[PDB]
RNA sequence: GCGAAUAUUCGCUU
RNA sequence: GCGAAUAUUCGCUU
């Protein structure tokens, strides 16, 4: 089960803000496993202003959309474009796609 | 964009029956393309009683769940288990998974 | 863990 | 169109 699945499954709210706050509450603080790389991340935040077509600056300095990144690097097609991105703070943050992340128990 | 994405995108309804009737109305009559095989099917019906863990009798007579079938035959992992199956009548019907089908314009 | 390339064999309505 | 096997080279926080 992916994080995107979890959003449309664990709680259903017709009020958009109530949906966004409850999903934000349910997810922030959970460890997620990416399907394309054996790495785990803590959900620090959910960025509703960004979607899979949003871009980021790579280590080599080139700008690519998340859609482009995961197709090129991992050959993972992001089908849903209306979803937000997950923020993970380390120590720039790692933006994660719900559709590309599994779930885990966490603190 | 997959059919499952479309369900959680095109119309949002807090009433479950109203959601199931409106999705049923929106989808029945559309051509869908499967991502794992270059084949297209008309949506004849949506079976809400069946999910990806439901089974079917193969041509060779062995019974397998849709989850097992698409992992073995096409190596396609169905993440969402709460979704229904799409019915397509030919000329037994072909049961299709929303998560594994793209969208098209159709009559 | 997901993939990419070349080569050779393969599986595929559900 | 999605894959499977063997072999050889590879890419990978975002």
UniProtKB/Swiss-Prot annotation, chains A, B:
Coiled coil: none annotated. It comes from the Eukaryota. Arginine methylation by PRMT5 is required for the interaction with Tudor domain-containing protein (TDRD1, TDRKH/TDRD2, RNF17/TDRD4, TDRD6, TDRD7 and TDRD9) and subsequent localization to the meiotic nuage, also named P granule. Expressed in spermatocytes and spermatids. Also detected in prostate cancer (at protein level). Detected in most fetal and adult tissues. Expressed in testes, specifically in germline cells; detected in spermatocytes and spermatids during spermatogenesis. Increased expression in testicular tumors originating from embryonic germ cells with retention of germ cells phenotype. No expression in testicular tumors of somatic origin, such as Sertoli cell and Leydig cell tumors. Overexpressed in gastric cancer cells. Residues 40-42 are annotated as: Required for binding 2'-O-methylated 3'-end of piRNAs. Transmembrane segments: none annotated. The record marks 95 as: Required for binding 2'-O-methylated 3'-end of piRNAs. Residues 2-105 form the PAZ domain. Endoribonuclease that plays a central role in postnatal germ cells by repressing transposable elements and preventing their mobilization, which is essential for the germline integrity. Acts via the piRNA metabolic process, which mediates the repression of transposable elements during meiosis by forming complexes composed of piRNAs and Piwi proteins and governs the methylation and subsequent repression of transposons. It is linked to Defects in PIWIL1 may be a cause of a disorder resulting in the absence of sperm (azoospermia) in the semen, leading to male infertility. Male sterility can be caused by defects in ubiquitination and degradation during late spermatogenesis. The PAZ domain specifically recognizes binds the 2'-O-methylated 3'-end of piRNAs. The MID region is required for recognition of uridine in the first position of piRNAs (g1U preference, also named 1U-bias). The D-box (destruction box) acts as a recognition signal for association with the APC/C complex, ubiquitination and degradation. This is Piwi-like protein 1.
């Amino acid at each position: 089960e992916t994080v995107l699945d979890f959003m449309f499954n664990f709680y259903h709210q017709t009020e958009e803000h109530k949906f966004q706050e409850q999903v934000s509450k349910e997810l922030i603080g959970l460890v997620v496993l990416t399907k394309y790389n054996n790495k785990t991340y803590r959900v620090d935040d959910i960025d509703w202003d960004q979607n899979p077509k949003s871009t980021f600056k790579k280590a080599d300095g080139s700008e690519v959309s998340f859609l482009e990144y995961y197709r090129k690097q991992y050959n993972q097609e992001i089908t849903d474009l209306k979803q937000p991105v997950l923020v993970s703070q380390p120590k720039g943050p790692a933006m994660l796609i719900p559709e590309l992340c599994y779930l885990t128990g966490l603190t």
